[PDB]
Design a binder for this molecule. Sequence first.
Ligand SMILES: COC(=O)c1c(-c2ccccc2)c2cc(Br)ccc2c(=O)n1Cc1ccc(NC(=O)CCC(=O)O)cc1
Length: 330
Amino acid sequence: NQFYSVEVGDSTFTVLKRYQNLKPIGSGAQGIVCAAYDAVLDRNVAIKKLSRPFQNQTHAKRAYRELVLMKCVNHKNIISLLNVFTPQKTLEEFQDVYLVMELMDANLCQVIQMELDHERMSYLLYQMLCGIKHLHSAGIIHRDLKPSNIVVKSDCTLKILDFGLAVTRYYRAPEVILGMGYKENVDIWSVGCIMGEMVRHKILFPGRDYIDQWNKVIEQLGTPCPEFMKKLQPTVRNYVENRPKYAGLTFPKLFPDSLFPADSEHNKLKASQARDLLSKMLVIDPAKRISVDDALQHPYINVWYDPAEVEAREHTIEEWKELIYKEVMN
Ligand SMILES: COC(=O)c1c(-c2ccccc2)c2cc(Br)ccc2c(=O)n1Cc1ccc(NC(=O)CCC(=O)O)cc1
């Protein structure tokens, strides 16, 4: 037959013959993801499997949009879709989608673990921004960026895996958390958290439930200003003012020098520049937050700036199932 079946944990991966020697590498919201060798292209790939996405309105939209978007966006810092296929032969039996992306070497989350120097770090954030820029120019604002969905290669290149919204909430910008409208730089917020996390190694803004999310933010950055507050909904604004007030710490408090290299004037100045960048991304009020182009130009990041890289309705389950299937036959 054209396909065969390998058992991967609770999953049975039923795949085209071209894809050899499957090994599990990780697991997100859509399910398990395997690395695989691809005899046709003689190179390694990733196979994400989507089980029955049509049977939930959200997964259904994430899946449709992402097929569509995947062949519709082409940027070196956005993961590329190599192939899609289902092993089922009619709509009626259709059930699983298999997506073949390109493959890297690690998760952003692991790379946050290493004691990074400014070279490696500025260059990763440069790429993140280039990629977000490319998604923005496209008409896509991600709103749900997080490190586990970003992957890297030994040579330190970097791909975003997904397209956000249009569990872990630690990186959602405040405008999102509070549902209050947003512009492009809602994505800058998350770059903030990931940048802090690279420095602090702890998650910036942990917090158990959503209410406790907020409270770790203001604890550190301080309560937002009133012209912010006036923008919430009548009811919604009341809920939030009902906390203790905070001044929030300065950014050399939040990110002391012990955390950066300090032997050299070079290292002292770079640290300074990082803190400034952070100081401008991690700004609760978007109206005052740095935006994407200005961040690429920022001294911490621009030793990398390359204009070549920088520039470039609802349904029923049934209807979703068809739309998704139809899209898999291309
Ligand atoms: C931890 O996994 C990762 O970070 C990862 C994920 C990933 C998986 C699930 C959830 C989030 C992201 C990924 C997803 C898509 Br779609 C496309 C590419 C990647 C990727 O390149 N890596 C790096 C990677 C590439 C290869 C390996 N290692 C192996 O392939 C092991 C092979 C073996 O053991 O023989 C590990 C990570």
